[PDB]
């Protein structure tokens, strides 16, 4: 608000995730490893309140590596045969400070035969003294 005496920092929590599992029988183009990525907020905290859209920059070896998510649970499901750093972007709803955050999530896949991959990690964005519109959405989250 515009009546600030104590500096308030509102923190939003975004979560990077991905699973990986191998099919013993690759696809036509020989892609063996199937995975799925996650960008969202913690359980009960909805990012769709302060978050607008989302984008994934997979590797160029992947058809249309940039996957955009303008909907609920933001994710990507693809198949390949290697891991890599995947620069993920979450778009924020603001006219103020950066309207995007880029999370370089490490896409690791497990060896053929026994792949258990289910990883989720949580990032923190603290906004010191944000405008009401921003504060307001961050609170609704």
């Amino acid at each position: 608000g515009s009546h600030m005496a104590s500096s308030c920092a509102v923190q939003v929590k975004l979560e990077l995730g991905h699973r990986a599992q191998v099919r013993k029988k690759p696809t036509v183009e020989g892609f063996t490893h199937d995975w799925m990525v996650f960008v969202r907020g913690p359980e009960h905290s909805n990012i769709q309140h302060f978050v607008e859209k989302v984008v994934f920059h997979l590797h160029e070896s992947f058809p249309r590596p940039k996957r955009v998510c303008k909907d609920p649970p933001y994710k990507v499901e693809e198949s390949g045969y290697a891991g890599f750093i995947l620069p993920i972007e979450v778009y924020f709803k603001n006219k103020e400070e950066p309207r995007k955050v880029r999370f370089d999530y490490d896409l690791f896949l497990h060896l053929e035969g026994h792949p258990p991959v289910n990883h989720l990690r949580c990032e923190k964005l603290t906004f010191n003294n944000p405008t009401e519109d921003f504060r307001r959405k961050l609170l609704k989250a």
Partner: peptide, 13 residues
């Protein structure tokens, strides 16, 4: 750590 191969055709620099 049974981590599968990784494509290093790109550059992180």
């Amino acid at each position: 750590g049974g981590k599968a191969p990784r494509k290093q055709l790109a550059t992180k620099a």
